[PDB]
């Protein structure tokens, strides 16, 4: 072995969805999408963490896609690799808008 989810308690997406109970209705990204992308709500602002890699994302923009942001900033994630595949992770990083996003900070 060697790999193990950073947050085993949130490996079940059904449990991840539950954390979005207090998710701001305000945000364009909906609980279903975020939970399916492997994220669970931190309960603070719009901060979410991935159960698998433990990476945290915040300050979501209107046109952000949970899977893309996941693959873009946390490309080594085992969950992203498992669900979306390596080709997708590579392609995401080549999209102009995302490439610039990653170069910015």
């Amino acid at each position: 072995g060697n790999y193990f989810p950073q947050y085993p308690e949130y490996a079940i997406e059904t449990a991840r969805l539950r954390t979005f109970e207090a998710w701001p209705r305000n945000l364009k990204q909906k609980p279903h999408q975020l939970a399916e992308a492997g994220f669970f709500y931190t309960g603070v602002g719009d901060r979410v963490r991935c159960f698998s890699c433990g990476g945290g994302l915040m300050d979501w923009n209107d046109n952000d896609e949970p899977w893309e942001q996941h693959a873009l900033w946390l490309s080594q994630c085992r969950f992203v690799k498992l669900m979306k595949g390596q080709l997708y992770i590579d392609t995401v990083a080549a999209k102009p808008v995302l490439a610039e996003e990653k170069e910015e900070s």
Binding site: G55, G56, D64, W73
Partner: peptide, 8 residues
């Protein structure tokens, strides 16, 4: 979105 935490 911005990654406030990236795995070490």
């Amino acid at each position: 979105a911005i990654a406030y935490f990236i795995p070490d």
